[PDB]
C-alpha cells in the first residue's frame, strides 16, 4: 500500500535526521561550561504585590518601557499596572470572561487578549477620548486562543488550540499567513528578537520554528515527552527554552538543530507553565504547578534560587526588557515583582 | 511640579478603577457559574432551553445568564472546541458546580460517559468542584427496558447480580426492571464519585422528572447545598 511506503519513507527521513544530529553532537553544554564559576545563591524579594484582580490570572506581558504591564484574569478584566507606583492605569472589561492570553504592543498603543471565545480582541489604549475600546475583533480561529504577540502596531501572531498558528493583518482583520503542521493544541509562542522568526510549543511534545515571511516550518524539535506549555527565545535568538508537563525545562539550539541541556530535579514532579530568560540569558526562570518559580543556571543547570510566596499555581512569568525585574502572576489573583 | 500633578492624577484614576473593581466584585462573588458537560446525545441543549424559558435571560461558548429567586446564575456550555479538553478544562477550576448530563437510554455509549465522568472527577484542577449528575432520557430508558430487545447485562456483566437498593423511591406506575436499571446506572456513576472524593467534593445524581420544573429546583438546591458546605468548610466547621 502507498501509506506503508510513505510511513517507511518518513521513518527513513527521521532516522537520517537523527543520525545527522548525533554526528553533529561532538560535545555537550555541560562538558564545555564545566570550567566556569557557578552563579551565587540568587535571592529575589517581592518589591511590589499588585492586587485588584478577582479571579485567577492567566497571562501577563511587560511593556517595552519596562514600567507598565498588562495582565488578564478569568473574571473578564484587563488591568494595566504602573509597576513603579503600583497604581492602576486601565481596567478593560471583556465580553468573554474566559481569557487565556494577553499581550502588550511594542509601542504601548494597543493591547490584545483572547481565550475560549476563539477571538483575538485588540484594544486601543491611547485613543483621542482616553477611553479604552475594542478596535478590531480578529476572528477565524476554530480553537481557543492561547498566546498572542505583536509584531508591530498592524501585525500580530496568535497561536490557537486548533493546532494552527496565524499572522494577522489588524487593519483588514484577515489572516495574512497560516502556520500549520502541529498535531496538538498550540500553547505557547515566542518571537525572535529580529521578529523574522518565532517558535511555538504545542501539546504534541514538539516545538516548531516558523518563518514569518514565508509561512513554513524551518525546523522541528522533539526532545520533550509531554505537552509543552511555555516557550521563550534566548536573548541571542539562536536558542530557546521550553516548559512541559513532564516537569522538565529543555534548551534547544537552532543552528545545532538539537537539544542542548535539560533542567530537571528528582524532587520536582509538577508541570511547568511559564519560562523566561534573564536579560543576558544566564538565568532561566520557570514557573511550576507547586506554586513556586525556580531560577535555573542556563549554562550549568544548577537551581540557583526559588521565588516562593504565591498561594496558588504560577501561570505567567515575564522579565522586563531592561532585565530590571521579573513579574510573576499566579492563580490567587495576585501579581508580584522580584529583583 | 509636573510630577506632583501626574502622581495625583494617577492616584485619582487608581481610586476610580478600584471603586469600579469593588463594585464588580460585589456582583461576581454573588453569581454562581455552572459548567455544562456531556456528550452529543446527552441532552444539554434541552436543559439550557428549559432553564432559559423558565427564567428569561441571555460562538465558542453557549453562555446564558439568568436570575432565579433573586440569585444570579451563569450556565455555559463549551462548544466549538476540538475533541481534546485537557487544556481548556483547566479554566473551570473555580466554577461552582459541573452539570454533567448522561443519556441513560444509550447503553452503547454509557461506558464513554462513565470514563468522561471519571476523568473529570479525578482531574488535578477539577478536584474540589462538585458535580450535579443529570441522568437524562428516563422515558426512553423505560421504553428500552420494557421492550426487552436490548439488555444491560450485554454491555455490563455486573448487572446480573445487581439488586435494587433499599433507599429507592417507588415512583407510581414503575416497573421493577425500570427502577432496577435506573438505580444500577446511578450507582455505577456514584461509585466513581465515592471512590476518590474523600469529602473534597460531592455528586448529586437526579433522574430527570420528564419535562418538569423540578430539574431547575434540583439545580438550585444543589448549588445552595454546595455554597452552604463551602461556607462551613471556610469557617472550619466541616
Amino acid at each position, epitope marked *: 500500500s502507498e501509506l506503508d511506503q510513505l510511513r517507511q519513507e518518513a521513518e527513513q527521513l527521521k532516522n537520517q535526521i537523527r543520525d545527522a544530529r548525533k554526528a553533529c553532537a561532538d560535545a555537550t553544554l555541560s562538558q564545555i561550561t564545566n570550567n566556569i564559576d557557578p552563579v551565587g545563591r540568587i535571592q529575589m524579594r517581592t518589591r511590589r504585590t499588585l492586587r485588584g484582580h478577582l479571579a485567577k490570572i492567566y497571562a501577563m506581558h511587560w511593556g517595552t518601557d519596562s514600567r507598565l504591564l498588562v495582565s488578564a484574569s478569568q473574571d473578564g478584566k484587563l488591568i494595566i499596572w504602573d509597576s513603579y507606583t503600583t497604581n492602576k492605569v486601565h481596567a478593560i472589561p471583556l465580553r468573554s470572561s474566559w481569557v487565556m492570553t494577553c499581550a502588550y504592543a511594542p509601542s504601548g498603543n494597543y493591547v490584545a487578549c483572547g481565550g475560549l471565545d476563539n477571538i483575538c480582541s485588540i484594544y486601543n489604549l491611547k485613543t483621542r477620548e482616553g477611553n479604552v475600546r475594542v478596535s478590531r475583533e480578529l476572528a477565524g480561529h476554530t480553537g481557543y486562543l492561547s498566546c498572542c504577540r505583536f509584531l508591530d502596531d498592524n501585525q500580530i501572531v496568535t497561536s490557537s488550540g486548533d493546532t494552527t498558528c496565524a499572522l494577522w493583518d489588524i487593519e483588514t482583520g484577515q489572516q495574512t499567513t497560516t502556520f500549520t503542521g502541529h498535531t496538538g493544541d498550540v500553547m505557547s509562542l515566542s518571537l525572535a528578537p529580529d521578529t523574522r522568526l518565532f517558535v511555538s510549543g504545542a501539546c504534541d511534545a514538539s516545538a516548531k520554528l516558523w518563518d514569518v515571511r514565508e509561512g513554513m516550518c524551518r525546523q522541528t524539535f522533539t526532545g520533550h515527552e509531554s505537552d509543552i506549555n511555555a516557550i521563550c527565545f534566548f536573548p541571542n535568538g539562536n536558542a530557546f527554552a521550553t516548559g512541559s508537563d513532564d516537569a522538565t525545562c529543555r534548551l534547544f539550539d537552532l543552528r545545532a538543530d538539537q537539544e542542548l541541556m535539560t533542567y530537571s530535579h528528582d524532587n520536582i514532579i509538577c508541570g511547568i507553565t511559564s519560562v523566561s530568560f534573564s536579560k543576558s540569558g544566564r538565568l532561566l526562570l520557570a514557573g511550576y504547578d507547586d506554586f513556586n518559580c525556580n531560577v535555573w543556571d542556563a549554562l550549568k543547570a544548577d537551581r540557583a534560587g526559588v521565588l516562593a510566596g504565591h498561594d496558588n499555581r504560577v501561570s505567567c512569568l515575564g522579565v522586563t526588557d531592561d532585565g530590571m525585574a521579573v513579574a510573576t502572576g499566579s492563580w490567587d489573583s495576585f501579581l508580584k515583582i522580584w529583583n | 511640579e509636573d510630577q506632583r500633578n501626574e502622581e495625583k492624577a494617577q492616584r485619582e484614576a487608581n481610586k476610580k478603577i478600584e471603586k469600579q473593581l469593588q463594585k464588580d466584585k460585589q456582583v461576581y462573588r454573588a453569581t454562581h457559574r455552572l459548567l455544562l458537560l456531556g456528550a452529543d446525545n446527552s441532552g444539554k441543549s434541552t436543559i439550557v432551553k428549559q432553564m432559559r424559558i423558565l427564567h428569561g435571560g441571555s460562538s465558542g461558548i453557549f453562555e446564558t445568564k439568568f436570575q432565579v429567586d433573586k440569585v444570579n446564575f451563569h450556565m455555559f456550555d463549551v462548544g466549538g472546541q476540538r475533541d481534546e479538553r*485537557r487544556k481548556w478544562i483547566q479554566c473551570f477550576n473555580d466554577v461552582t458546580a459541573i452539570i454533567f448530563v448522561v443519556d441513560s437510554s444509550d447503553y452503547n455509549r454509557l461506558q464513554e460517559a462513565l470514563n468522561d465522568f*471519571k476523568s473529570i472527577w479525578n482531574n488535578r484542577w477539577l478536584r474540589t468542584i462538585s458535580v450535579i449528575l443529570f441522568l437524562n432520557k428516563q422515558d426512553l430508558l423505560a421504553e428500552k427496558v420494557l421492550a426487552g430487545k436490548s439488555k444491560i447485562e450485554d454491555y455490563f456483566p455486573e448487572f446480573a447480580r445487581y439488586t435494587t437498593p433499599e433507599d429507592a423511591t417507588p415512583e407510581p406506575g414503575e416497573d421493577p426492571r425500570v427502577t432496577r436499571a435506573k438505580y444500577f446506572i446511578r450507582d455505577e456513576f456514584l461509585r466513581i464519585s465515592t471512590a476518590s472524593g474523600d469529602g473534597r467534593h460531592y455528586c448529586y445524581p437526579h433522574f430527570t422528572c420528564a419535562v418538569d420544573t423540578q430539574n431547575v429546583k434540583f439545580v438550585f438546591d444543589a448549588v445552595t447545598d454546595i455554597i452552604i458546605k463551602e461556607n462551613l468548610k471556610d469557617c472550619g466547621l466541616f
Partner: nanobody
Amino acid sequence: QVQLQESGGGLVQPGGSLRLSCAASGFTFSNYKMNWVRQAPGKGLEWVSDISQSGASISYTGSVKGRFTISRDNAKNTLYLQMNSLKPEDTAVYYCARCPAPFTRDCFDVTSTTYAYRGQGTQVTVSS
C-alpha cells in the same frame, strides 16, 4: 520523540486467542499510566483497558472483562494485551495509548480522533 509501536494483530478464528505488544520509546515508561483503545469499522474510538504506573490498578470495559488481560513490564518498556475468547464484533484496530501527563491518576483525550501519544494501531480481525 514519543513513539508507540504495536504488533500481534492478524487473522483469528472466533473463539481464538491473541496477544498484543506496545514497544514504547522516547519517554520513561514507569511514570505514565497506559491504555488500550480500539476502533471498530464504522465506529469511533472506544476505550478498552488501562493500567497504573506500577500495575496495581487495572480496569476494563464490560464487553471485554473476563476475556482481555492488560499487563506492563517497566524493564522492557512494553505493554501487553492478551485477548481470549475473541468474538466477531471485536474486529477493530487496536491502539496503545498513554496518559498525557506523568504521575496523574486521570487520563484525558485518550480516545480523541487525533492524539499525539498514540500508536499507529494494529488491525485485529475475527472471522470463521
